[PDB]
Amino acid sequence: RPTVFRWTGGGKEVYLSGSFNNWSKLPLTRSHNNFVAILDLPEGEHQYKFFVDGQWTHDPSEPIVTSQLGTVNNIIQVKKTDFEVFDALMVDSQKCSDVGPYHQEPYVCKPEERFRAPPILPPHLLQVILNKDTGISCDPALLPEPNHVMLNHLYALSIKDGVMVLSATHRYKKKYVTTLLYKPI
Amino acid sequence: SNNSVYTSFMKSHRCYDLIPTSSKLVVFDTSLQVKKAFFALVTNGVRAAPLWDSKKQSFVGMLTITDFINILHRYYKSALVQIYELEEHKIETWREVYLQSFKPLVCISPNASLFDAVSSLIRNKIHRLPVIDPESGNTLYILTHKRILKFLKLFITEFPKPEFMSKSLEELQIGTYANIAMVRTTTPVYVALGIFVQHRVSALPVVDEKGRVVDIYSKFDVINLAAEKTYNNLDVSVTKALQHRSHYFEGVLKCYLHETLETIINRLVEAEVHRLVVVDENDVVKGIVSLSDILQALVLTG
Amino acid sequence: DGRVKIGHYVLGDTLGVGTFGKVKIGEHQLTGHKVAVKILNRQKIRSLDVVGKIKREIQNLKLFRHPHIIKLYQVISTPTDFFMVMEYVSGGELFDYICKHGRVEEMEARRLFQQILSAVDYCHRHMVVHRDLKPENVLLDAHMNAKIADFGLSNMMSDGEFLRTSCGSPNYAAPEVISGRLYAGPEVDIWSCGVILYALLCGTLPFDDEHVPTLFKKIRGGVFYIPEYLNRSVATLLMHMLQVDPLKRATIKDIREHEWFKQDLPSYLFPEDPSYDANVIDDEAVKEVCEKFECTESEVMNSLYSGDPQDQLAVAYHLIIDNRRIMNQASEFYLASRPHPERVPFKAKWHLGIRSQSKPYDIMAEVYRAMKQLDFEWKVVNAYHLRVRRKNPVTGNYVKMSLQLYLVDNRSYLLDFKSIDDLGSHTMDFFEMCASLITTLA
Ligand SMILES: N#Cc1c(O)c2c(-c3ccc(-c4ccccc4O)cc3)csc2[nH]c1=O
Ligand SMILES: O=P(O)(O)c1ccc(-c2cc(O)on2)o1
Ligand SMILES: O=P(O)(O)c1ccc(-c2cc(O)on2)o1
């Protein structure tokens, strides 16, 4: 399983020494400010440190462990989830989640006063499928192919004769049905 | 035998394959008044609508032009008095009089074969079959004999044509030739509506004073009384009720006995008409061939 | 010896830096085969909170199989980085080709645009919108074929949903994108494609200015100079593609119907074309055969790539392909365009939700009061966007609905109703829930 050891810091010569190579200096290839080496390592805890310009150092951004004599060396935990992409993304999403069921309580409008304006109505929703004239030649039940954005949205007629007329376009598998309901108020 | 190839086609294809990419479906609540529902069929351009019972929370039936035909004939008294039951009664109230025979909801699943859909229409003697998804419970499309024959007409080149398709109508004897209920040119609408209720037929050929068939007064021609708001005057002749739509009507369309079954199917599909008048060599009326008789021959019986 | 290697490939010079991560050239240590390796730092993704964006990007590229979209071979995962091993193209950026030649000739410019739109249509059919289409993101190979690459700013297309994010270079962004307004988003790509088409033929941008608000004013205005060397045919196509109103703006079907685009267009780039069904694989049909024959996807392919077309698995695939073609050809049977016999019987105009002239804060209070009366329970995800629920007493199931307030004009406001999908009837449950709130509010 591959493991990446990148040195973001500066320097001319950078060496990698860890428990995986019996604590021996490994020369890193430099591109610009990057000193890297990809090593095949098994799953488990691995301790390592950097040797920059003839002096011992560690990556401050990475987790560290200190010994009895006081030598700092980074510690990497090679997990089974790190080998597969979707397994690693599932773990990465869990760490991302930082600081609500159904209720009958109304929302407070805003911190202080938001003065928040509602989003501008999209022109796509104004394209009513039932208004659109199909023309004489075709069957009256037939309709043009609707835009995906107008699906599931409610369209209604003004209440006349004490009866409310409601319509919405919904998708069966690859087909769209525009149902109309005549329900009295 | 090369026969039963169309029967195998209906068994292989689902009801889903006929539903259009984007279609219009009109549904009525049982508590809605009949008058408003029949005007809604006109405005939306539909011939039938599934009925939704709000209390039961399930589809109960279908509201067709036959309901309007039955309401008119049962409650009409005169042109001087208004048809009270058409003006005030709800669909719920009308069903408690008409269906009291508690008929269950005759429907089909979109995943079910076309053979079952053709069988359900012929067996139950219905012309409108609602397609309801068992997963969601929503009505998707209303299946008809016309839609099935039009879909089959698209795949006729994909499958080898059987021996009966090349054979003549006189050899096969498809359609009704005896007990044909007809109406005269001077007969009133009320009498014509009575024959639709008693004989339970879908169309009535109109005969002239000389004896020749001038037009066809079908069940669909009744919603024009609701469209033109001329429903309370049923004393007027059939010709007087058809003249307003007579321009773009084209009711009478004939087929000869010597003509092959294939040419008859192609004529019904292209003209989009429900039936053809069967005529002899001397252009004399022999019988009537409809979409139901055609699909009963192709799909059912083998 | 000390070479930086990942999956047998030696990492070399940096090709460029995209939306997320760096792209480097990867040479095979044994063969010398070249690949483009996109390195994604796990900590950088966690810091920017784009774990979901990267997840969808990998999922789409693993599914995408188009000759004009950069192919993803594999994705190697390490405890600190993600290595996306992609298809390498020697020619580089389309932007660099335009600058090198000054102006791309009509014969090549048409050929390249047809290849670009073929890739854009594939994305849209798979409910994916690129949102960052520019000649910098359009790459070229040794055989001069166009290839779209950066799917960093890309997003999914959902039913009854809109995308708000503002993405990409201002010179390629649509007027609705720069304004921060909601969009469906297929249209946004067309605008970007319109700018690329102008950049190919003219060698300049139709909307270009040093000052950012002046540049934004030019995009919103939709006024651009059409040079004298461009014919009236391509001029009308560029005008239709570059429309301020997204509704009046051209669609892929409109571009495909255009006479200039039709010229020398190969019959394999777009679906429903003559040589498409016989040369391009249909993903939906293969899965349908795999479940019917109870076999793997590789075996279905082997039967198609075999010498005999009468092979058991191949004939089953083409039966679905043939049946689909017959149904697709009969457009008049499935879709609406002497009068029709059913029209012999036959107006009140329809409107979206409830319209109000009242204050936005006052409209909210009316909705919260109405729900309480009906005993609805809701989730307040946003100030103007709610997720309401109601349990049906007969069926014994919950009915989900989405409420959203919109601004029609300076004095008008609209309340939108949307159904949420996870015996009765789901659609009837939505209408009855809508009818209850409409009656109570008015
Ligand atoms: N962006 C940046 C970036 C990297 O360059 C790498 C690298 C990397 C750095 C340099 C080299 C390299 C070294 C010597 C010669 C050529 C190279 O490409 C190879 C890979 C490994 S993980 C990683 N993560 C990053 O976010
Ligand atoms: O029996 P139905 O399904 O109620 C019915 C209603 C109308 C028709 C009809 C119309 C027409 O021209 O042919 N049949 O059939
Ligand atoms: O009883 P039929 O005359 O044989 C018949 C055939 C086809 C129809 C029909 C009527 C209708 O509204 O949809 N299909 O009715």
Numbering used by the authors:
A (entry chain B): 78 to 176, 185 to 270
B (entry chain E): 24 to 123, 125 to 326
C (entry chain A): 8 to 344, 358 to 366, 393 to 468, 526 to 545
Pull text from the paper:
AMP-activated protein kinase (AMPK) is a metabolic stress-sensing kinase responsible for regulating metabolism in response to energy supply and demand. The AMPK αβγ heterotrimer comprises a catalytic α-subunit associated with β and γ regulatory subunits. Adenine nucleotides (ATP, ADP and AMP) bind interchangeably to the γ subunit where three of the four cystathionine β-synthase (CBS) tandem-repeat sequences provide nucleotide-binding sites1. The α-regulatory subunit-interacting motif 2 (αRIM2)6 is required for sensing the adenine nucleotide bound state of the γ-subunit and transducing this signal to the α-catalytic domain, resulting in either stimulation (AMP) or inhibition (ATP) of AMPK activity.
Secondary structure elements of αRIM2 are crucial for the isoform specificity of C2. We propose the weaker interacting α2 isoform αRIM2 is incompletely engaged upon C2 binding relative to the α1 isoform, resulting in the α-isoform specificity for allosteric and synergistic activation and protection from α-Thr172 dephosphorylation. Importantly the structure reveals density for seven α1 RIM 2 residues, including the main-chain of the nucleotide sensing α-E364 (α2 E368), further supporting our proposal that the α1 RIM2 interacts more strongly with the γ-subunit. Interestingly there was weak density for the carboxyl group of the E364 side-chain, possibly indicating a transient interaction with the γ-subunit residue R70.
